[PDB]
Write a protein that binds this ligand. Sequence first.
Ligand SMILES: CCCCn1c(Cc2cc(OC)c(OC)c(OC)c2)nc2c(N)ncnc21
Length: 207
Amino acid sequence: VETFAFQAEIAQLMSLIINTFYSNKEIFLRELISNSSDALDKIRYESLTDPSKLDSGKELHINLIPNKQDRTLTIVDTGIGMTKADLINNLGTIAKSGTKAFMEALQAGADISMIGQFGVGFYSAYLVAEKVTVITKHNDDEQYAWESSAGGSFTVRTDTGEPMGRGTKVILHLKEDQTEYLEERRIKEIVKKHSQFIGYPITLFVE
Ligand SMILES: CCCCn1c(Cc2cc(OC)c(OC)c(OC)c2)nc2c(N)ncnc21
């Protein structure tokens, strides 16, 4: 287990997402599904010139998996996945400028639902989750677990759970008062409202 500090601006963004009063929390799901969709476009595009990129799995889909016992909602994709370098350095580096612009825009009166335009919609997970665990496997790298409860740090470790082939699982450990996002009817409503044109099958698992 390696522990890392977020760059100061990302820590500030995370605290703002956790601390600001903002009732329209449901927008987290569209942000995460959109990230999965982008990741599936990416591996789809790369495989046009190198079909061996799909040896790790041909099926391109998104699964939404609620689990009331664990209080988790998991967004699964078989997209491109993320390398260790992504997880520790590169996404954070790209995210710094997006963070600064988002924070600026939040005066001029943008609101939190606009986070996705700044490339940091991932952090919207913290509207609803007290901890987020990301299991991910990229073709060029090993399977990793990233995790953070915010507070300025995150961890990364090689994952020894079940091998996933290729892609990403974002496990949202939900806040005690956010268990509505485990209900089948609430998830269907949100997907229908915000994500009904995604070009990959989205399967809502039931309990
Ligand atoms: C361009 C942003 C892409 C990074 N990313 C994201 C969003 C993301 C964004 C992050 O920082 C902006 C980040 O660092 C903490 C991260 O770590 C797990 C994930 N989701 C996926 C996904 N499902 N599959 C592939 N790449 C993804």
